[PDB]
């Protein structure tokens, strides 16, 4: 017993680019998921295992707080069976995924007049990610054949783009902080519970 440090994930001052997404292992703590689902401040809150009522009543060996920023029209893609720039090249969930996506509009925090260049995403990739792969490679994307020779140019894409979040974009093109809770049962009996 003390209190799981969800505080550190949700109220984080800075948040990760989606290519370079953060994971935070949660172990050896109480929980209290209801602080989460009862916030006001969550625009999105799909669960995919479990009614978030009865996940307060249940115990897991580990919990992971995957946490990045995307644009609002991308938050469609943070789910099972999804497809596009974000699901394919930046953050895939599995088809059998059982946990919770939370997100919320962060236009106040993560925008600037001229653009916030800090957030980025990956535009091209020789194939799609496996579930929960991350790729923080640079490496010039070869869209043609005829090779790149480390020039960026025609058919030769530097494959990480900036979002450039202004506060005068429309809601589809403004930044959303996302947080995926993933829940695994294993051998070594329990670590994270519910009071």
């Amino acid at each position, epitope marked *: 017993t003390n209190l799981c440090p969800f505080g550190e994930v949700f109220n984080a001052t800075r948040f990760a*680019s989606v290519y370079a997404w953060n994971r935070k292992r949660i172990s050896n703590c109480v929980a209290d998921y209801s602080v989460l689902y009862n916030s006001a401040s969550f625009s999105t809150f799909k669960c995919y295992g479990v009614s978030p009522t009865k996940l307060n009543d249940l115990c897991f060996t580990n919990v992971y707080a995957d946490s990045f920023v995307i644009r609002g029209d991308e938050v469609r893609q943070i789910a099972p069976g999804q497809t596009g720039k974000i699901a394919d090249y930046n953050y895939k969930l599995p088809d059998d995924f059982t946990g919770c996506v939370i997100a919320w509009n962060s236009n106040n925090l993560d925008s600037k007049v001229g653009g916030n260049y800090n957030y980025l995403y990956r535009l091209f990739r020789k194939s799609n990610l496996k579930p929960f792969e991350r790729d923080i490679s*640079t490496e010039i994307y070869q869209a043609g054949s005829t090779p790149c020779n480390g020039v960026e140019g025609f058919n030769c894409y*530097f494959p990480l783009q900036s979002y450039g979040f202004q506060p005068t974009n429309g809601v589809g093109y403004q930044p959303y902080r996302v947080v995926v809770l993933s829940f695994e049962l294993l051998h070594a009996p329990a670590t994270v519970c519910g009071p």
Partner: nanobody
Amino acid sequence: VQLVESGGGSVQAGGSLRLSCVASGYTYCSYDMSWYRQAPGKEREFVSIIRRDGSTAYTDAVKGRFAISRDNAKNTLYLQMNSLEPEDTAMYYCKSWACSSGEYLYQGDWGQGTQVTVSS
């Protein structure tokens, strides 16, 4: 980690300039590094990268006029700009890319930028 650009200024076209970016502060791994530029009113375009394995890429506009170099001894990143045209006028920005070590992950950083300004 706190990047800080320097060098650059007003320069007659066909001259040269050395940009210096100086890292300050630690991190639990070693990261790639880029030059970006943002022209007047155009957005931020990539200029070059250099990676852990010592590979470079350059943007086709600057390929063979411009050269990226690190001195890890002094934690300093170098852009040699030669035979500057007016098109090369821009605010120039150094960027540190990501890396992991273990559970931890480093995001990156941009600097304030410095103004290059190329007449004729």
